[PDB]
């Protein structure tokens, strides 16, 4: 695919709710005509972004001409956040170059909607628990109390449980591995003999 005039962003996969970061939005032009762009982004209540270079109007970008802007933003919500960026062209602004037609298709404005991830702020740390239950033709029970909310933040708390029996995780490879021919001294003879 392609687009004669589009907008692409850059940002990491995941971020942290507390600290901020910049979001780098580039715009690219491949049509011969050289046009000033109106670029920006619509934002949600689930974070807070601010520009760095908003006051100044861009001038123009020509074929293979790419401009770029940024936005210093801090997330608020947790998980996945869609980020929306709108870019379009402008007519009757012949101040950068010779002409500026600025007449694209019905979708003349690139309106891209991109998500990202954010993890919960604070030093992530864990807690482990284990249990071996074996009803030998019968019933057994247990109870496990999970409570460590000192100086914590809501909803970072997660847990999970896993049921299995783990003798077979390595019972394949090692078992089929070591079955060998005896030879050598009595020491080596035992070495090769005993394990089997």
């Amino acid at each position: 695919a392609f687009q004669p005039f589009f907008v692409e962003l850059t940002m990491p996969y995941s971020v942290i709710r507390g600290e901020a970061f910049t979001l780098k939005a580039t715009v690219l032009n491949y049509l011969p005509k050289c046009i000033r762009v109106s670029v920006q982004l619509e934002a949600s209540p689930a974070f807070l972004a601010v520009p760095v270079e908003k006051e100044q109007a861009p001038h123009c970008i020509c074929a293979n001409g790419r401009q770029t802007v940024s936005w210093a933003v801090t997330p608020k919500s947790l998980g996945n956040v869609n980020f929306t960026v709108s870019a379009e062209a402008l007519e009757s602004q012949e101040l950068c170059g010779t002409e500026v037609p600025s007449v694209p298709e019905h979708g003349r404005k690139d309106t891209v909607i991109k998500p990202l991830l954010v993890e919960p702020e604070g030093l992530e740390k864990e807690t482990t628990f284990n249990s071996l239950l074996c009803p030998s033709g019968g019933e057994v029970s247990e109870e496990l109390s999970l409570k460590l909310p000192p100086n914590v933040v809501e909803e970072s708390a997660r847990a999970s449980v896993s049921v299995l029996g783990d003798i077979l995780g390595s019972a394949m490879q090692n078992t089929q591995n070591l079955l060998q021919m005896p030879y050598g001294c009595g020491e080596q003879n035992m070495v090769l003999f005993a394990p089997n």
Binding site: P120, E121, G122, L123, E124, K125, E126, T127, T128, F129, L146, L148, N151, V152, V153, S156, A157, R158, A159, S160
Partner: peptide, 11 residues
């Protein structure tokens, strides 16, 4: 179980 900490520890 997992969670995040350090809203204090400031001197």
């Amino acid at each position: 179980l997992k969670y995040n900490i350090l809203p204090e520890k400031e001197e």
